[PDB]
């Protein structure tokens, strides 16, 4: 039960030669045949091929100082950027690998960075050691990410990144880390490495590689950043990644003594050839790609190419002739990222089903013996012709300078097992969701500007997929943005919208906050006939319906009653809803930290707590309603626009609830209100649907009652918070007694109150769960009385009961900080490729 | 309250086609997914499929192929019909009120037994 | 499809004991798609657990539900006779719904 497991691929990244600051983009430099040689860059000081920001570095992002940004090798930054852009490919957000055996292999040397004298204003001191220690460079990555696998910088020059890959392949077999990441990073900050080549007559004039081609007259010198994410297959598919390839065997040797330190040996290159091969139970003739070590020297590609010869070369049979290519033709020699930007090129060739091509300048070299027919330069696209088993394979190869030598086979993945895929909560609207975040605001409008380019680009994408990418495979920051899209187009507008600064529907904005939130629970007029109809089929909130059902009629004769009111019947509904929007606020993530709620609204709220049960919260709702159109007739209430005290003729008419600073309700006798009433009509008065009036004198008749009726009621410890608008303080959930429900009924509601007091104990998000927002208004004016930055959100609104709108609920929630579980929301759909976290990189180069 | 009635010919011959229908009474048959549950002898209950009020079905692939069930609105009726029958459709047929698309089942009807046999 | 592993095959007791039923998924499910049925014999199934732990109107208390990602357990405190019967899980989460095999819950003597 144990054996060489083979370790898959499921994430990439690189930064290379060219403009290319992606896997993508490096398809497009091989099918253009354009190459990078280009001058060196004046602002270094001291032909060849550079990375496009090779000194540009967003600092703040990983919470570096800029003066230890400034001590950092250029390479130790690289590598730092380019190992999160790796996770964000493998759809992992590195906030959750915090404390996990991840561990970091970096493939590097030493290329002169910070060899002159500090100039003390650079104050530089006491950051330039660990800024330019080989160690440093893979120690730093687990650092800031919290990876606690092994950490290595390993230096075997060119072909350092397939020894780390070779290292976290075992490393992985064997047991050491459960996730790897890998690769090489190199930056050319000074002239050293230049020009020992250029002394040596090793490097061409042009720049350029020529590999294999008779023009080829030394190699040039590049640079870059080039890192993939391993896993063992078994753990890759148990956790559904996408796997972009598999190592299916690796090796590593050494020239020993060739003629030379540097000297090429094709016997070694042979051997670690066969033992790949071997590690990987194939011949050659399973490999159609060979993506060569490939540097366009006169008397090396020969030697190179005898070595395939011997080889790949051999006993081809069914098998066509294996193709041939090199990266270098296109970037230059990339050095420590050598290897896995060969990597990155043959899974690109994988994903598009063809063969990766390579830049051939001029002739075949007269060098080497094509007579056999059997190697064949990958001259433009081609067919990747399957193996015998029906599996694509390639072969890439790196033979480093100091003469130890890599070779890998890179197969196609497996076909993954099928799984029942989870439900979506929600019935599909054909809306879906699509969340940005970022840590800054600009950081922010650039991820939108970006994923509304690739859409554009990109059209066809699912977007569905998109949905799912961008918040499952994610790390949500603290500027925040989504927008609702019922398709690709839509989306590109409104995201377009986020970038530039725009105000249109189906779009919000938002900072994400510490601070709890807080369930208020209404009652009052939210209700609308039809009412949440269009959840019905969500499991979740239909399961709540149906058992309020069942209690309503033992206690009332009531149901569902909106197959197609009065106030014994409109309040049990109003209860029934609001405790199932509760319930299905919970299964998409949003608990409460505390529950809050007005007049009635308190009896859901102390079910949504779970101080009393469904049944009693039933039947408190039921024989207090009940109890209520037993003193019908006179009494009425009015909302007063204007706030109290000013507000406050007496002993017919009182305040019987404060809502805000600007409102407050007011009770008592019928007539005598229309007096106060047709009085404001030369103050925005309205009186509300009510034949009595509560929170008044007129409810003392029903007391003893009630009180009796719900003596059997079991209060109990809640596992929420209740706040009390009453007590105005939490409240031990047993306390919820009769006499509490009899004096909820008679005293005053004092809910500006208790909504001043949640914002001073700084809780951070109002939601209002109810079908129509009703208090809403009123809180978003406390909250600017107490210049908070507290937000408010509602649930259902009139003419907007639907999923679309508990979607945009869940929207905004999730914008300003609220936990929606965005798995049990868009159930699990596939990671599609989009832009990386939009790096705002200053330059900083010693 | 809420009760349910299916009926429907039980005894039936190789490749015909099984017909049962439910009634339900005093629930409201809109917001609901009415809702076929087959249980072979002794064994595990597998779900057939359900319908709501308005007309959108679901069925499990396994049977998708050879099954189709509807719903009269002014008769509050809906029906299992089940094509090219076999020994193994042999199973006490049930229909159910689904609190949701694909959810639990609360009320029940009374079960009929199909018998396909020669 | 996913499939639901009940345990064990038939357990027996007598009344007062505490039974303790499991079920196996296949795969995680969330907790909101789970249920427990129970089947007197030659009747309908009756609801007793929906999501996992909310114990249907009209079932006495001492019927628990709990358990998460592929493993439930339904749990009864105090064994009266009329709760000898089979029982059954159901996952409702994955597109196809399935029900357990069932378990047996007879008279020990």
């Known amino acids: 039960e144990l054996e060489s497991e083979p370790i898959a691929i499921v994430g990439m990244a690189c930064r290379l030669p060219g403009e290319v600051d992606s896997p993508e983009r490096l398809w497009e430099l091989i099918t253009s045949g354009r190459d990078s040689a280009a001058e060196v860059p004046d602002d270094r000081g001291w032909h060849g091929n550079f990375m496009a920001g090779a000194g540009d570095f967003d600092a703040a992002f990983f919470g570096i100082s800029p003066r230890e940004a400034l001590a950092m090798d250029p390479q130790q930054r690289q590598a730092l950027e380019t190992t999160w852009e790796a996770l964000e490919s493998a759809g992992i957000p590195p906030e959750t690998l915090r404390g996990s055996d991840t561990g970091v292999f970096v493939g590097m040397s030493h290329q002169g960075y910070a060899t002159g004298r500090p100039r003390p204003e650079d104050g530089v001191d006491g950051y330039l050691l660990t800024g330019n220690t080989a160690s440093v460079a893979s120690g730093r990555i687990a650092y800031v990410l919290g990876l606690e696998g092994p950490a290595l910088t390993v230096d075997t020059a060119c072909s350092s990144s397939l020894v780390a890959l070779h290292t976290a392949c075992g490393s992985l077999r064997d047991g050491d880390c459960g996730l790897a990441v890998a690769g090489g990073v190199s930056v050319m900050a000074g002239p050293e490495v230049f020009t020992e080549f250029s002394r040596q007559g090793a490097l061409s004039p042009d720049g350029r590689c020529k590999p294999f081609s008779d023009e080829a007259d030394g190699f040039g010198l590049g640079e870059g950043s080039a890192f993939v994410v391993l896993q063992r297959l078994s753990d890759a598919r148990r956790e559904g990644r996408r796997v972009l390839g598999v190592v299916a065997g690796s090796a590593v040797n050494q020239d020993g003594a060739s003629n030379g330190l540097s000297a090429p040996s094709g016997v070694a290159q042979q051997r670690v050839i066969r033992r790949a091969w071997a590690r990987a139970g194939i011949t050659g003739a399973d490999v159609a790609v060979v993506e060569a070590h490939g540097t366009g020297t006169r008397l090396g590609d020969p030697v190179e190419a005898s070595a395939l010869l011997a080889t790949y070369g051999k006993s081809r049979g069914s098998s066509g002739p294996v193709l041939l290519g090199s990266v270098k033709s296109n970037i230059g020699h990339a050095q420590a990222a050598a290897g896995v930007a060969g990597v990155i090129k043959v899974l690109l060739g994988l994903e598009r089903g063809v063969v990766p091509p390579m830049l051939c300048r001029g002739e075949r070299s007269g060098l080497i013996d094509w007579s056999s027919g059997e190697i064949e330069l990958a001259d433009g696209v081609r067919e990747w012709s399957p193996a015998a088993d029906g599996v694509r394979r390639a072969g890439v190869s790196a033979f480093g300078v100091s003469g130890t030598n890599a070779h890998v086979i890179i197969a196609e993945p497996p076909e993954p097992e099928p799984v029942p895929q989870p439900r979506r909560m929600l019935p599909a609207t054909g809306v879906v969701p699509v969340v940005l975040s970022a840590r800054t605001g600009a950081a922010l409008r650039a991820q939108a500007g970006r994923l509304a380019d690739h859409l554009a680009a990109h059209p066809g994408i699912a977007p569905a997929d998109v949905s799912w990418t961008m918040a499952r495979a994610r790390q949500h920051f603290e500027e925040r943005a989504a927008v609702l899209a019922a398709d690709t187009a839509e989306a590109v507008h409104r995201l377009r919208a986020v970038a530039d600064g725009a105000v249109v529907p189906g779009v919000v904005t938002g900072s994400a906050s510490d601070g709890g939130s807080v369930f208020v629970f209404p009652g009052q007029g939210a209700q609308w006939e039809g009412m949440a109809r269009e959840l019905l089929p969500v499991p979740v909130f239909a399961e709540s319906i149906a058992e309020c059902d069942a209690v309503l009629s033992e206690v009332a004769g009531f149901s569902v009653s909106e197959v197609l009111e009065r106030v014994d019947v409109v309040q049990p509904v109003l209860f029934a809803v609001m405790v199932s929007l509760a319930r299905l606020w919970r299964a998409c993530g949003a608990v409460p930290s505390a529950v809050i709620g007005h007049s009635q609204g308190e009896i859901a709220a102390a079910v949504v707590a779970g101080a009393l049960s469904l049944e009693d919260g039933m039947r408190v709702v039921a024989r207090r309603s009940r109890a209520v159109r037993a003193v019908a007739g006179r009494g009425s209430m009015l909302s007063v626009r204007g706030g109290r005290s000013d507000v406050e003729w007496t002993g017919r008419l009182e305040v019987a609830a404060v809502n805000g600073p600007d409102a407050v309700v007011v009770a008592g006798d019928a007539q005598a209100a229309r007096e106060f009433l047709e009085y404001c009509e030369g103050i925005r008065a309205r009186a509300i649907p009510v034949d009595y009036a509560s929170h008044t004198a007129h409810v003392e008749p029903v007391r003893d009652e009630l009180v009796q009726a719900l003596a059997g009621i079991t209060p109990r410890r809640a596992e929420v918070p209740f706040f009390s608008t009453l007590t105005g303080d939490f409240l031990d959930g047993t306390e919820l007694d009769a006499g509490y429900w009899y004096r909820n009924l008679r005293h005053p509601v004092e809910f500006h109150s208790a909504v001043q007091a949640l914002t001073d104990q700084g809780y951070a998000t109002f939601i209002e769960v109810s079908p129509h927002p009703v208090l809403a208004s009123s809180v978003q004016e406390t909250l600017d009385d107490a210049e908070s930055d507290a937000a408010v959100l509602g649930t259902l609104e009139r003419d907007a009961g639907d999923a679309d709108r508990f979607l945009t609920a869940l929207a905004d929630a999730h914008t300003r900080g609220v936990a929606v579980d965005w798995e049990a929301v868009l159930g699990r759909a596939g990671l599609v490729d989009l832009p990386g976290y939009p790096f705002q990189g200053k330059r900083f180069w010693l | 309250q809420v009760q349910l009635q299916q009926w429907g010919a039980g005894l039936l011959k190789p490749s015909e086609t099984l017909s049962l229908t439910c009634a339900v009474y005093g629930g409201s048959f809109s917001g609901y997914y009415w809702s076929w549950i087959r249980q072979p002898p002794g064994k595990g209950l597998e779900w057939i499929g359900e319908?709501?009020?308005?007309?959108?079905?679901n069925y499990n692939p396994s049977l998708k192929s050879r099954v189709t069930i509807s719903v009269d609105t002014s008769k509050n009726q809906f029906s299992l019909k089940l094509s090219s029958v076999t020994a193994a459709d042999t199973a006490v047929y049930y229909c159910?009120?689904?609190?949701?698309?694909?959810?639990?089942?609360?009320?029940w009807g009374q079960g009929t037994l199909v018998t396909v046999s020669s | 499809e996913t499939t639901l592993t009940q345990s064990p095959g038939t357990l027996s007791l007598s009344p007062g004991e505490r039974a303790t039923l499991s079920c196996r998924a296949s795969?995680?499910?969330?907790?909101?798609?789970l249920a427990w049925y129970q089947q007197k014999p030659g009747q309908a199934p009756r609801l007793l657990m929906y999501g996992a732990s909310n114990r249907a109107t009209g079932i006495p208390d001492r019927f628990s539900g709990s358990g998460s990602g592929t493993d439930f357990t339904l749990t009864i405190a105090r064994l009266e006779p009329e709760d000898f019967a089979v029982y059954f899980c159901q996952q409702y989460g994955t597109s196809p719904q399935t029900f357990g095999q069932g378990t047996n819950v007879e008279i020990k003597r």
């Open positions: 159910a009120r689904g609190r949701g698309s694909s959810s639990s089942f609360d009320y």
């Open positions: 319908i709501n009020h308005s007309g959108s079905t």
């Open positions: 795969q995680s499910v969330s907790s909101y798609y």
